[PDB]
Amino acid sequence: GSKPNYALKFTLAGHTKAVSSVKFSPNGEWLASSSADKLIKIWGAYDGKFEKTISGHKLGISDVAWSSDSNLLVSASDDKTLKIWDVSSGKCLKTLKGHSNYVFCCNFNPQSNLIVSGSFDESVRIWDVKTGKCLKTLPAHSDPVSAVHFNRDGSLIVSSSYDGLCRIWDTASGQCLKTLIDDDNPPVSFVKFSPNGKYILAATLDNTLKLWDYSKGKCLKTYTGHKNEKYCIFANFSVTGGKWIVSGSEDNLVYIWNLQTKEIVQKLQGHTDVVISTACHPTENIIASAALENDKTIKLWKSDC
Numbered sequence: 001g002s003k004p005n006y007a008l009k010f011t012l013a014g015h016t017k018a019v020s021s022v023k024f025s026p027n028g029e030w031l032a033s034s035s036a037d038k039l040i041k042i043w044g045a046y047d048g049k050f051e052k053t054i055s056g057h058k059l060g061i062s063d064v065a066w067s068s069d070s071n072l073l074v075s076a077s078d079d080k081t082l083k084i085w086d087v088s089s090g091k092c093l094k095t096l097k098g099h100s101n102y103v104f105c106c107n108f109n110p111q112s113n114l115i116v117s118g119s120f121d122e123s124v125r126i127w128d129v130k131t132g133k134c135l136k137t138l139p140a141h142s143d144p145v146s147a148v149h150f151n152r153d154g155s156l157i158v159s160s161s162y163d164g165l166c167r168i169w170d171t172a173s174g175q176c177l178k179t180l181i182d183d184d185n186p187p188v189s190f191v192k193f194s195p196n197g198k199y200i201l202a203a204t205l206d207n208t209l210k211l212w213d214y215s216k217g218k219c220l221k222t223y224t225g226h227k228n229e230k231y232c233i234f235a236n237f238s239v240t241g242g243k244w245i246v247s248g249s250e251d252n253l254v255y256i257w258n259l260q261t262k263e264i265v266q267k268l269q270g271h272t273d274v275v276i277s278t279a280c281h282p283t284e285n286i287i288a289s290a291a292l293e294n295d296k297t298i299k300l301w302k303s304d305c
């Protein structure tokens with residue numbers, strides 16, 4: 001139908017501190033979760049079945065991300081490292097050392113030969129997956145880096161920061177192509193490219209999501225109604241059914257907007273703390289949501305539309 005009807009199907013318990021991130025594997029079979037409890041957990045995407053715990057970080061994890069082939073994970077930790085993991089063996093393949101403060105955010109490129117990271121040390125680093133070596137350190141921002149993401153062909157990186165900027169980087173050279181958002185404030189708490197790489201979705205800590213045209217550097221859409229003044233809350237393009245924007249909220253709800261009309265089309269109730277992370281299944285109309293330490297659960301929601 002014209003609106004979704006997401007309904008709670010499973011609650012996934014086991015983390016002992018706040019959940020920080022949830023991500024579906026590109027092949028759709030898994031959900032990965034990261035937590036302040038220093039653990040990664042792997043769950044069945046369709047039935048929430050607990051699969052395994054992946055351990056090794058010495059402090060909390062703020063983010064986890066899948067390789068394009070669903071075989072590897074990368075995690076970003078307060079221990080100042082990222083780790084590359086073989087999901088099947090659960091083994092740490094590489095530890096990526098160089099950041100001088102907490103690593104907050106990470107992603108593979110589509111090729112999955114590179115990892116990008118953002119840190120409280122105000123830098124963005126680009127890493128070689130095969131060797132675990134740091135290829136480039138970008139002096140990207142003047143405050144902690146909240147998000148990093150590659151576009152569809154891997155040629156661009158978008159970064160965001162508490163400094164109030166969103167910057168687009170040439171992967172190959174590390175050089176800045178554009179400062180897309182250029183304000184002293186508000187802090188930019190999240191950014192990512194649209195699936196086709198033409199748009200950037202940006203969150204600011206003034207309860208606002210905006211959809212930007214990268215090429216023209218202009219705001220096309222604004223989404224409001226939710227609460228976001230403190231946390232770096234993920235947002236998503238939902239593309240399997242109707243074309244939605246999805247975000248967590250500091251009022252403990254998942255918000256779903258019509259991307260084109262900007263109308264709120266659903267609010268998902270059930271969590272008992274801030275919903276810091278949401279993920280959209282690559283093929284099925286399924287949302288994963290995760291909450292902070294009063295809750296510590298992941299919820300799987302399913303829609304007909």
Ligand SMILES: Cc1nc(CO)c[nH]1
Pocket residue numbers: 020021062063104105146147148189190191232233234276
């Ligand atoms: C908690 C968290 N938010 C982000 C957004 O990039 C990374 N980790």
